[PDB]
Amino acid sequence: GPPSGKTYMGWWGHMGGPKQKGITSYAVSPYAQKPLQGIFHNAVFNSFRRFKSQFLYVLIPAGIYWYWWKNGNEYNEFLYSKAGREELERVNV
């Protein structure tokens, strides 16, 4: 076949990753173990640990933009509420 350019991942056998020695893997086959292990304990506990770990990264931006949105909405409401003759004109321009 027509040779192609250099590639960072080979196929099986010549996969290209660093050669290693002494690493041992295992398995127990799907049929010899219960499919649903932990199901609830891991569910609740890991779910709460994960939600605790990254809470602030989603809390802070949401709070900031919610504060902006609330302030903008309230000022817009005040603008067109018995204020179209004394405040609307001086800020529209």
């Binding site: 196929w11 099986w12 056998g13 050669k19 290693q20 020695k21 086959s29 049929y31 010899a32």
Partner: protein, 431 residues
Amino acid sequence: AEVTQLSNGIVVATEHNPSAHTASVGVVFGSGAANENPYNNGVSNLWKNIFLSKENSAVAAKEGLALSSNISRDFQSYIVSSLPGSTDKSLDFLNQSFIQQKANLLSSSNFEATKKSVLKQVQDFEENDHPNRVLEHLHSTAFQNTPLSLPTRGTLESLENLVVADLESFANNHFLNSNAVVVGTGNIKHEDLVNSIESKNLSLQTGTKPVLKKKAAFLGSEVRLRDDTLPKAWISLAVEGEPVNSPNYFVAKLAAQIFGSYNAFEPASRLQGIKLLDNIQEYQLCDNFNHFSLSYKDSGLWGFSTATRNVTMIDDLIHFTLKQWNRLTISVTDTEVERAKSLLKLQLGQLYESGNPVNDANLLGAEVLIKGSKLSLGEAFKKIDAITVKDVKAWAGKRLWDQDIAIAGTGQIEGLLDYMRIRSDMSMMRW
């Protein structure tokens, strides 16, 4: 020329054969690797080695007789070969230096030298051999948490942590008289039949073997030791065979011998064979086969071991072997079965009747402990011609069809797909 057995305290058996003229007498203890806990592994190895060194040095210097041994899973086949006219001396030495006394043998110096020698031997076995290593790993991964997965050699951590007391404790808990026999394969007739039972020629430690709490089990697993440094590859499938003393030993042996061995670098093997060998030979896929169906008193293993050279083409070799096993359990030609019967006949004839008395003695000991009585090959030939296609169909419908497999290999296995590309394709969805 007929095997004789009895029961007078210690079982004595004899397979007279005036064809050869190398008389052999020894013991076959019904315990070994299977009869011992994981934490103290190489105790049997250490026993065998201390014997095979110092007792050898004693016997050759004193008299003429070369002593061997063997441990497979539950034997200590301390066979002591001799001349036809020199069996009394061999028996006297065996009963004066193996059962008792053990003080002149287990000196600290000899024990320590043998300990370091055993360490070196097991180490270079780990660093050099490969098919035996993957076979041992296959046993260790098929029988997790069971007194059969531990190897017949042991682990360095388990080897180092035992000095004298553990060895003597195992001696006194397994070198009894209840599960120990005497085997006299060679060209002796009845001198061994009467001289074993004498005024004092008897094993010490009367009692019984401590029964194991759990015997055996099975579960699918993998133990791969992927290292690209080694040149070739190594894999070993496995499916749970049939234990000894069952009406399935010979049918399983035939179901294994159908596909047969293969050596890709021999002019007299590529040309012959059956479908998988041709379909492999069209390209270059594999380099060796070994269909083996090993059986033990607790459970047996039907295996398939290869050591290929191509690395990218593992998947195709596995896929073809699996489809051929499915073909075995779906439909077999009558000529295939007849050829298998003939081949297995000649193979048994060679194995059981090899001129070397030690092999026959070890096999006789194994059978007499497990079966309770020797099965002369005449009955085997009589009952082997009755094996028919329906029987093999039925047996493969149980042992093979959608049954958990265990594989374990060291080398460049990386190309091998993990589990669901070698397991869920034993039926090919069209039976």
